[PDB]
Metabotropic glutamate receptor 7 (Homo sapiens), 432 residues
Amino acid sequence: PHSIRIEGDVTLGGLFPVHAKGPSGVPCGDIKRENGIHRLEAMLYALDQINSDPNLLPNVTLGARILDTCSRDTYALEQSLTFVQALIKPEKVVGVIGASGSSVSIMVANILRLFQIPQISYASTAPELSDDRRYDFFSRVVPPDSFQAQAMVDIVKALGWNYVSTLASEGSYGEKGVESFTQISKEAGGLSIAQSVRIPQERKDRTIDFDRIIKQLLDTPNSRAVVIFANDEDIKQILAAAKRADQVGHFLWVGSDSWHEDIAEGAITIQPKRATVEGFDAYFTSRTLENNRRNVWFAEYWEENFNCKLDRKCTGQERIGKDSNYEQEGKVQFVIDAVYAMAHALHHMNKDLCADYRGVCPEMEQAGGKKLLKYIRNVNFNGSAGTPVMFNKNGDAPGRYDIFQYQTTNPGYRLIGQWTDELQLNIEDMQW
Ligand SMILES: *[C@@H]1O[C@H](CO)[C@@H](O)[C@H](O)[C@H]1NC(C)=O
Ligand SMILES: [Ca+2]
Ligand SMILES: [Ca+2]
């Protein structure tokens, strides 16, 4: 109902959107099965892995205080005060994993700075978080969208889409993405923005006409492509409308939280490199109501996931993946790697400040978050998908993206390239 509290020598805070935003006056709405429950469980799995690992924090157990953000920055701010109760068996929190949404992470980062508590996000890509003046204690295992914007300009230019229109969801994400993309395009040369269209907020009183919006973009003079900065709901409707359109277009889209469908052939997207962590699937799919009381939200997840109540009644014999559809949520790798980054930082701090000791020294206990922050910023290790985890001077993961195209040759998103220190576009793998 409230929180997951796990005792340990040092305690990690966690922030996840276990629930969506509630109706209007209510803070919390429905369970978010993938973005909330899978991500939370990824942290719990990571802690279990570290706590059984004899070569990482050999004599130091990791505990946790994991809280629900209800996808609201105000609610998360209030929750975050739990992490400082020892200062103001009182819980002393050395670092925080989260939040998910960028607005949530920003708000959280503002309070955690004041108490010198380092934070590592597994999903927040807002460029403003890279500014170490305002967000010195904030790091992230995902890259900022500033890198993504450059990659988009690079792809658009390489494909010869020298006149484009932009389409963005209403909100600060879409506005920021378009101004960022626009600014980079001005600096690059050979790329002109024909028009910028904004999608209205999804009000219950109306139904947005995506067919009209797409038709107008495809009839714009000069425009070779549409570049899309979208939320989850908007992207699904935009690409369905694109598929239904009278004319074929070129589409490049970013945003959403994903990693039968109605998607226009050849639509391109660019998203941070990630992969399935197989050990997590075995853990998560074997969870039951009997063996997973640790997750205090798991009974609610169960009722939603199997459409039953504890009006079909839950038996407890339902199994994840058998009686429901299961695919690993795309950011599980990042949650795990955030937790491992914190652990590697603590391991090195312990080895530098301590020796031959059961648990944490007074010297390590006295080091504080400013010092742990430096250790965090200097970690360098192979993460849960066998790829390197590190941060730049601003606390940002390097810009490493895969490029996908939706294909109907023989149907789904296919890997057609990547953007790292170079742009690799495999023109031979693309549909023409
Ligand atoms: C952990 O405990 C063992 C046995 O007491 C000891 O040899 C080792 O030095 C300890 N490690 C650390 C990092 O304190
Ligand atoms: Ca250990
Ligand atoms: Ca930062």
Summary: Residues 144-273+399-432 form a domain with the Rossmann fold fold (CATH 3.40.50.2300).
